[PDB]
Amino acid sequence: LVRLPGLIDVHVHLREPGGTHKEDFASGTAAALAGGITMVCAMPNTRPPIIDAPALALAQKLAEAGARCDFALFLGASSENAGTLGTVAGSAAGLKLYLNETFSELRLDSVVQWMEHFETWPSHLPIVAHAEQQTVAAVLMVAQLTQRSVHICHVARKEEILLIKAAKARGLPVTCTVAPHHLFLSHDDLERLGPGKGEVRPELGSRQDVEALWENMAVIDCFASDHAPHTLEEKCGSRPPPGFPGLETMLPLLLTAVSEGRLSLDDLLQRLHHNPRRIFHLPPQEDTYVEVDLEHEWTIPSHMPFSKAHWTPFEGQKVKGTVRRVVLRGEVAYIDGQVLVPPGYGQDVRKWPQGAVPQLPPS
Amino acid sequence: LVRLPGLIDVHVHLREPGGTHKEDFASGTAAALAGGITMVCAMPNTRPPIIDAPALALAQKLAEAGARCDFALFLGASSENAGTLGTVAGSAAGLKLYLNETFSELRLDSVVQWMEHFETWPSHLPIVAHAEQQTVAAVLMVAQLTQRSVHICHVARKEEILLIKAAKARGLPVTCTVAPHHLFLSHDDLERLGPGKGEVRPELGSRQDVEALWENMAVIDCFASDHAPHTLEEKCGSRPPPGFPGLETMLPLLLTAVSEGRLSLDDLLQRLHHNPRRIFHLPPQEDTYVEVDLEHEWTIPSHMPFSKAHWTPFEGQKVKGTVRRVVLRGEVAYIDGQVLVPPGYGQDVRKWPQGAVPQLPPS
Numbered sequence: 001l002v003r004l005p006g007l008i009d010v011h012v013h014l015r016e017p018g019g020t021h022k023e024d025f026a027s028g029t030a031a032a033l034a035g036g037i038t039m040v041c042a043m044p045n046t047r048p049p050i051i052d053a054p055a056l057a058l059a060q061k062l063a064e065a066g067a068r069c070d071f072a073l074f075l076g077a078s079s080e081n082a083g084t085l086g087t088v089a090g091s092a093a094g095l096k097l098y099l100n101e102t103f104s105e106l107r108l109d110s111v112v113q114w115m116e117h118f119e120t121w122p123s124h125l126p127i128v129a130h131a132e133q134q135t136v137a138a139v140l141m142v143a144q145l146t147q148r149s150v151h152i153c154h155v156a157r158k159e160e161i162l163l164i165k166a167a168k169a170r171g172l173p174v175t176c177t178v179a180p181h182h183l184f185l186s187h188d189d190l191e192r193l194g195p196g197k198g199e200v201r202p203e204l205g206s207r208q209d210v211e212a213l214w215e216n217m218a219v220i221d222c223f224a225s226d227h228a229p230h231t232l233e234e235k236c237g238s239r240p241p242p243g244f245p246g247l248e249t250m251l252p253l254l255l256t257a258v259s260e261g262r263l264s265l266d267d268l269l270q271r272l273h274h275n276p277r278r279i280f281h282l283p284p285q286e287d288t289y290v291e292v293d294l295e296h297e298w299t300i301p302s303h304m305p306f307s308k309a310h311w312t313p314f315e316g317q318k319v320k321g322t323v324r325r326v327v328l329r330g331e332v333a334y335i336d337g338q339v340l341v342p343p344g345y346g347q348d349v350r351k352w353p354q355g356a357v358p359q360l361p362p363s
Numbered sequence: 364l365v366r367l368p369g370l371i372d373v374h375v376h377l378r379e380p381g382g383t384h385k386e387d388f389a390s391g392t393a394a395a396l397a398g399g400i401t402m403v404c405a406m407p408n409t410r411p412p413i414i415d416a417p418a419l420a421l422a423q424k425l426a427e428a429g430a431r432c433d434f435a436l437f438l439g440a441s442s443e444n445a446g447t448l449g450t451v452a453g454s455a456a457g458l459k460l461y462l463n464e465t466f467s468e469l470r471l472d473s474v475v476q477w478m479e480h481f482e483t484w485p486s487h488l489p490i491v492a493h494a495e496q497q498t499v500a501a502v503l504m505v506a507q508l509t510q511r512s513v514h515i516c517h518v519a520r521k522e523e524i525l526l527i528k529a530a531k532a533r534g535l536p537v538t539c540t541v542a543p544h545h546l547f548l549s550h551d552d553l554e555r556l557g558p559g560k561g562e563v564r565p566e567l568g569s570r571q572d573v574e575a576l577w578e579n580m581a582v583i584d585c586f587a588s589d590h591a592p593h594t595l596e597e598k599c600g601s602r603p604p605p606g607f608p609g610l611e612t613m614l615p616l617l618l619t620a621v622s623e624g625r626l627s628l629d630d631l632l633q634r635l636h637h638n639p640r641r642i643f644h645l646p647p648q649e650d651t652y653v654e655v656d657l658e659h660e661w662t663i664p665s666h667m668p669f670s671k672a673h674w675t676p677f678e679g680q681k682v683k684g685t686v687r688r689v690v691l692r693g694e695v696a697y698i699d700g701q702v703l704v705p706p707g708y709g710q711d712v713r714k715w716p717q718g719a720v721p722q723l724p725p726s
């Protein structure tokens with residue numbers, strides 16, 4: 001067995017409030033623990049969406065009562081809320097901008113609206129953007145015009161990682177995350193998945209996109225699942241929403257890659273622990289660790305045990321490595337397929353004294 | 364009468380070679396002279412497209428034999444020609460990038476291809492981009508990464524002009540052009556035009572887009588027609604190509620605006636003479652001038668006399684101001700509805716000693 005620190009997934013969709021047949025805080029954080037994850041950051045594209053103080057207050061209580069691991073909640077940018085989030089901004093994981101079409105009603109239709117958010121959101125707090133292809137260059141321009149940093153979530157294309165690489169070479173403050181489906185799946189998999197299951201944003205890339213991401217691993221700051229649960233009925237239906245569940249498969253896939261020498265254990269810990277902490281200013285978790293077994297070989301089944309999504313695009317993949325035990329803040333939280341902490345054990349890390357983002361005092 | 368210097372239209376499509384039922388050098392430059400224009404820069408989206416030395420050589424001869432006014436020819440960026448244009452680059456007006464869907468096969472599908480052109484095209488030579496909405500921010504980012512300037516053609520939206528305004532305020536080297544249809548037409552006109560005639564890229568904007576362009580006139584560097592002739596049969600057909608003819612209506616519309624006090628005569632001369640010269644390094648034309656009459660009131664007819672397009676989206680608009688006489692290099696070129704210089708009178712200004720772009724000698 002190997003002992004790892006508590007891993008952090010900075011990009012999950014837990015569907016509560018409003019989509020709880022797909023997942024809720026209790027089921028989604030159970031999936032997190034089973035995947036060796038002890039802290040999650042939940043996206044705001046719920047129903048109602050987390051785009052104002054009252055929606056945030058509601059989500060916070062739902063999470064505090066339902067979460068089994070620790071968490072922070074993102075606020076979402078809308079066409080109406082720029083300049084209105086200053087009072088609650090510090091209590092959120094960060095601000096999420098949806099800049100392309102995806103499972104969300106929050107798309108901003110004008111770059112001027114992006115600028116307004118970059119100008120009004122506190123400068124010391126994280127901004128994350130769903131930005132695909134040329135949109136990555138556009139949001140980078142807005143970040144430069146407003147003189148601040150931006151984080152690009154789920155980078156999926158050779159085009160995108162090479163653009164980010166060029167920006168870092170010029171010293172621009174940009175960081176990025178890559179999700180496991182964009183490292184381990186490609187167009188070649190759509191035959192097997194079909195057009196419904198295969199729907200995700202950004203879409204699965206070519207083999208060349210996948211190869212470019214591996215070749216440019218040094219450019220990738222974080223891994224995150226983009227856990228996006230939808231039921232099989234929805235994925236197989238007439239208007240399939242995009243997204244894959246992934247909390248329970250992420251670490252097993254990456255541990256397999258480690259065992260094959262495609263990256264080191266440190267590469268993994270930088271991207272699932274240290275970089276998430278430092279980019280999102282997330283606090284340490286006392287007495288918290290994950291024990292993995294690197295020798296157990298298994299095949300991913302048609303669905304993982306915990307997520308309500310009840311399906312997985314990785315069905316049939318051979319992996320080596322499994323999560324054996326998770327201890328969270330001194331309590332056994334997970335052992336071999338059984339979660340052992342109840343809904344509500346998890347806490348909002350932004351309310352911990354060490355979880356606040358340091359800022360310069362009033363002028 | 365008022366005497367103006369020779370006006371320059373930096374963005375015309377003359378359709379030769381390959382689309383000569385829509386327009387050719389002879390008919391298109393006749394339309395230019397009638398519109399008070401003595402020098403045009405022709406775009407490369409012809410058939411074959413001007414994307415290599417042999418296509419350029421062909422277009423140059425066709426222009427030299429057919430043009431009635433002076434001209435320069437753009438090269439077009441393709442997915443294959445980056446790094447191959449150095450030998451002929453200096454003979455072109457500049458390099459044109461097509462970054463969105465429009466009447467062209469030259470769209471570049473990856474921002475990496477944009478970067479390659481910005482890195483390989485000589486740094487002292489003009490680059491123009493068809494870039495809409497967020498694409499404006501994206502190409503600006505590529506210009507910054509490669510540390511050079513870019514010119515944005517046909518700006519049509521409040522979103523775009525405000526982005527450019529913000530970039531100029533930060534001292535970024537960007538310039539832009541606005542076409543008359545985006546100052547004088549809007550959504551409100553689509554009722555009258557219909558869905559076929561009304562097809563253009565960028566599409567007609569809202570009244571708010573139009574108002575934003577007028578309010579931000581100080582941000583606009585050039586006016587150009589984006590003369591994009593297609594026959595009525597094509598515009599009224601099942602797959603209408605986008606674009607308006609505009610060489611013969613541009614100056615009359617702008618002179619009307621001058622007479623109404625919406626801008627000054629100087630505002631007009633900066634944008635149709637001085638700024639085109641300095642951004643594209645176009646040479647002066649000896650013994651060349653345009654005489655306009657600011658008092659004659661008339662209504663734009665169903666088609667203007669010269670363009671083969673044989674239709675106009677400005678039909679029915681009341682204008683005040685008309686071109687009475689054009690002298691080009693010491694010859695009467697146009698009087699009151701009659702062109703008096705033959706096809707081939709016009710010359711390639713990039714072959715004039717004063718028409719070369721100054722550059723630092725070899726290292």
Ligand SMILES: NC(=O)N[C@@H](CC(=O)O)C(=O)O
Binds near residue numbers: 103
């Ligand atoms: N990526 C997806 O395909 N879906 C995500 C939304 C998102 O991350 O854009 C979801 O919330 O379902």
Ligand SMILES: NC(=O)N[C@@H](CC(=O)O)C(=O)O
Binds near residue numbers: 408493562564
């Ligand atoms: N603007 C248009 O609607 N059409 C132009 C092309 C262009 O300028 O994009 C054309 O060549 O027809």
Ligand SMILES: [Zn+2]
Binds near residue numbers: 102130
């Ligand atoms: Zn997303």
Ligand SMILES: [Zn+2]
Binds near residue numbers: 012226
């Ligand atoms: Zn997401």
Ligand SMILES: [Zn+2]
Binds near residue numbers: 465516517564565
């Ligand atoms: Zn264009």
Ligand SMILES: [Zn+2]
Binds near residue numbers: 376406589591
């Ligand atoms: Zn054009």
